[PDB]
């Protein structure tokens, strides 16, 4: 069904390639925490290329023409637009299936977030190469919503800690229950058949 992807520590083109391949098959994929998607290269170069992309505009009418989004979710959505056949009613359905969110919505606070190993910064970059933050780029050029998103992110991180302490307490209780007795008759069978 849905594929809730974390966006922290992923590279833009790698994650866009994997999302654009998995969205043409029908798996409804949603990339959350889009402000944390890293981009390799120097951050000055990345904002210089994005400034050149802003400089690209129609001169006879700027409204009828290139629409330059500043929000990082819409940056990733344009990145996947440039890779899907969006002029056809296959890539149009794929863009309808794709959803993207800066920050985290409440149902994606509820559900578990996946992490793609092939798109990671650590996997795809030598650790002495420079990088960038898409949220830093978006706040530096246009997207004026870094502080509100960071405040709500710290709020949901505190919520995640106060849920995780309860979950870890329940896991300590169930391992006390596993430490208790009168369960081993099935457990010998399970150890002999892959506990």
């Amino acid at each position: 069904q849905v594929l809730v992807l974390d966006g922290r520590g992923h590279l833009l083109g790698r994650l866009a390639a994997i999302v654009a391949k998995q969205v043409l098959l029908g798996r409804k994929v949603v990339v959350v925490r889009c402000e944390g998607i890293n981009i390799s290269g120097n951050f000055y170069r990345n904002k210089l290329k994005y400034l050149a992309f802003l400089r690209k505009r129609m001169n006879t009418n700027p409204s009828r023409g290139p629409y330059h989004f500043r929000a990082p979710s819409r940056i990733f959505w344009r990145t996947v637009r440039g890779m899907l056949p969006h002029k056809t009613k296959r890539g149009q359905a794929a863009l309808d299936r794709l959803k993207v969110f800066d920050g985290i919505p409440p149902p994606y606070d509820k559900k578990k977030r996946m992490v793609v190993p092939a798109a990671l910064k650590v996997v795809r970059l030598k650790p002495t190469r420079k990088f960038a933050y898409l949220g830093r780029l978006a706040h530096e050029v246009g997207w004026k919503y870094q502080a509100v998103t960071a405040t709500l992110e710290e709020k949901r991180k505190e919520k995640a800690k106060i849920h995780y302490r309860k979950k870890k307490q329940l896991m300590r209780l169930r391992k006390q229950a596993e430490k208790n007795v009168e369960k081993k008759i099935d457990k010998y069978t399970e150890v002999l058949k892959t506990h």
């Binding site: 001169n59 006879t60 009418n61 700027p62």
Partner: protein
């Protein structure tokens, strides 16, 4: 907008604002909402909204309107305004607003003399005027066939379009414009109750000291007979007579 909580006693001028045809309407606005005010069980579901308003909101804007019966106009419809209270914490802003629901706000309470306060409004209505009157371009000379008040060249050949910066026949006026940094001279009350039987005492400074009113000799041209609080602004202010300004 999280949620909007109105007051109880809503005036007929606000009801004329909420309706289009006041004659054809049966005047049925806010009957169930006033029933929610009257019900004691509805008060607990109404004060729960303010307890949620203290917790989840940061920007509180208060709706206010004008009394049209104190004007020489003919409109008789109020004008609703969200006014962002820039006070302290949300709790005491909400307490201030609930304390001052259904109450009047003078000009001396917020504004003051010698204050530099901007004006927002809509320009005059000049209509669908031409190019030399809209963009103030130079006229063509007398010998020009097919026009004198025109832009003579629009674009080059190789852009086979018309650029958006080219001066063309746009409608002049009735545009939203704001002008910044205008000083207030005098905020003065007028026409107080009959202890003194009718006090005029306006535009009567420390050096004038004579009986005089707000209005000029013969009333204001196309406005009327101002008998209320009034702001005495500097320079030229955007708009015609009888026009709503913020």
């Amino acid at each position: 907008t999280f949620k909007t909580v109105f007051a109880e006693h809503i005036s007929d001028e606000c009801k004329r604002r909420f309706y289009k045809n006041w004659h054809k309407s049966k005047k049925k606005a806010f009957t169930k909402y006033c029933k929610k005010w009257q019900d004691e069980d509805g008060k607990k579901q109404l004060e729960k909204d303010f307890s949620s308003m203290k917790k989840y909101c940061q920007v509180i804007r208060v709706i206010a309107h004008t009394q049209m019966r104190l004007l020489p106009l003919r409109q008789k419809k109020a004008h609703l305004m969200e006014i962002q209270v820039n006070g302290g914490t949300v709790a005491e802003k909400l307490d201030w607003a609930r304390e001052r629901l259904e109450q009047q706000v003078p000009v001396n309470q917020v504004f003051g003399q010698d204050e530099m306060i901007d004006v927002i409004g809509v320009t005059k209505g000049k209509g669908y005027k031409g190019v030399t009157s809209r963009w103030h371009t130079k006229k063509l000379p007398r010998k020009t066939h097919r026009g004198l008040r025109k832009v003579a060249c629009i674009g080059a050949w190789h852009p086979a379009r018309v650029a958006f910066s080219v001066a063309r026949a746009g409608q002049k006026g009735y545009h939203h414009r704001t002008e910044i940094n205008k000083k207030i001279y005098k905020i003065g009350q007028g026409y107080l109750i009959k202890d003194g039987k009718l006090i005029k005492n306006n535009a009567s400074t420390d050096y004038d000291l004579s009986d005089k009113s707000i209005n000029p000799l013969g009333g204001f041209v196309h406005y009327g007979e101002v008998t209320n609080d009034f702001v005495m602004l500097k320079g030229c202010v955007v708009g015609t007579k009888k026009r709503v300004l913020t």
